[PDB]
Amino acid sequence: GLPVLNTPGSNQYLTADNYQSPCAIPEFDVTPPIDIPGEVRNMMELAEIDTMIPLNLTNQRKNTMDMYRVELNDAAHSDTPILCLSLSPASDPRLAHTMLGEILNYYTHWAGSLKFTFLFCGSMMATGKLLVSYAPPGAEAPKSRKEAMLGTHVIWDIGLQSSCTMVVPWISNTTYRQTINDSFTEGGYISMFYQTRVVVPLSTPRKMDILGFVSACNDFSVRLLRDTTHISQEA
């Protein structure tokens, strides 16, 4: 017959190979498809949908519907943060379980811009201005509005348009970041402060909630498929 020479790698089974194989059920009459609504072509499409962030992971609130609610009040102006977060979308406990974080945990690298949308759920009679901020890594994490205001920030005025979006631009040294907590590929800090204060008239609730949402921008991508730690199996 035709002279052949077997090269190394022969008879192995690479779990990620892409070869042809014989069909065990030949000439099978396959049921044709129908146009079912909601077809998906890329996993990144799912990462671009707003998903609610479990921002309040305090012991009494974590693992309850309260982990999603961050409460505000009509107290006099303060320069202390309403919330603090680290830009580690796949590893920070508050981001790791969102739709975005879930997908990132099936990949080793991520790159791109993100956007955080906040919804004000107070009454119509409530007003206020808030400062949402993003500080690229390398300096002290902002602890006062004075430090936060020096980085990327959006001053949100509450009114008819109930929500406000802050885009966290892709500012990185490496071309891709890792989906694990690693200082070399650290992303920075997200924080919120009161710009003025929440003001309500009489006969109106003085405390109300805001909900946060996170999604990927159109320049977001992931690579190196890996296994997630979000699912296990004992015995």
Binding site: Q20, S21, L160
Partner: protein, 68 residues
């Protein structure tokens, strides 16, 4: 019945073959009658996320007020 596609060269060798010619193409031939036996081509398309990201009846511009 051979299908000749081109590869997306990542790391380039110090050759002109790394930038052109059949040296950056790959060849494919199906050996089985059933399409199930075929490998995946992996030349897969994308689409608009709008059906999920903006399943809104009355289309809105980001610059313009959402609640109008």
């Amino acid at each position: 019945g051979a299908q000749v596609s081109s590869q997306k060269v990542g790391a380039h060798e110090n050759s002109n073959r790394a930038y052109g010619g059949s040296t950056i193409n790959y060849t494919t031939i199906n050996y089985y009658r059933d399409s199930a036996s075929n490998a995946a081509s992996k030349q897969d398309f994308a689409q608009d996320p709008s059906k999920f990201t903006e399943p809104i009846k009355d289309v809105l511009i980001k610059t313009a007020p959402t609640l109008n």
